[PDB]
Subunit: 82 residues, 4 copies
Amino acid sequence: VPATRILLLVLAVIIYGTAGFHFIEGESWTVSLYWTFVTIAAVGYGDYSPHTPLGMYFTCTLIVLGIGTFAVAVERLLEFLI
Amino acid sequence: VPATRILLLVLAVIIYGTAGFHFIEGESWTVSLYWTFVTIAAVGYGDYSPHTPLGMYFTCTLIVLGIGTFAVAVERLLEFLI
Amino acid sequence: VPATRILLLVLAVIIYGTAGFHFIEGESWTVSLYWTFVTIAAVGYGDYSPHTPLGMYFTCTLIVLGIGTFAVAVERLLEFLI
Amino acid sequence: VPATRILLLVLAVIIYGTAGFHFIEGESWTVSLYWTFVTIAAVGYGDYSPHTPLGMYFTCTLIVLGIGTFAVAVERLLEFLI
Ligand SMILES: [K+]
Ligand SMILES: [K+]
Ligand SMILES: [K+]
Ligand SMILES: [K+]
Ligand SMILES: [K+]
């Protein structure tokens, strides 16, 4: 898969996660973006996490759609940086 | 391995983890399902975790059986989504 | 690498991590074993973590030696289970 | 890629993360180094995390640049240790 397509795919995941956390959990856009990276990179500090049923459901979807997408994106980035 | 078989395998892991956490740690079904995804995707927020010896033992088994299963499942999903 | 050798290697990492956390951080053997799995599987709930300089140094070594070892072990286990 | 080059690359990431967290979040050098490993290995205990907007932005960059770099480094280390 072309590196640029992978880039678009991860950006789409980042938008999905950021907007979802912002509207569902009520955190700021900045905190939501940060939480999205922390989540799809599977770093998960837990400083932020969903506290509502809908948030938990949403997070599971982001986990399933974002973790794999992020993994592929980073490796491809490694090539263009190495 | 057929994608559908991998799907069944991860669903089985999700059931095992959710039921185990629910009965051993006493959290709701929804919270238990959420914790199971957070755990097998190795996101681990820590908002929920085992507080009993049996829970800790159980979690280690879920980690060993679920993390690898989840990893294979996500990649296969990437193919059908990309 | 033979699956059995990989098994021995991960068991050695588990012993190293469990004994180290127990003696350095002072947690029980059970909690230490649990923390070791949570750490080498890179789940990291944070319910337990090092609170001393030596503990932090030790944890970094466990991270470097255990995460890769655990990853290889799980995949090999996937074969014998799938 | 030569193992030694990968080594230099991960060391560079470790310096970037440690210095950044120290100056941006104000934690000690030791705690910052520890947090950097915990973050790039994607262990993420959450005992330490950024509490400022700049820190969050910085952490996202470290996540993108360090997680992949660390992954490649550990595998290469596995070869020289196994
Ligand atoms: K992880
Ligand atoms: K991981
Ligand atoms: K974590
Ligand atoms: K993690
Ligand atoms: K955590």
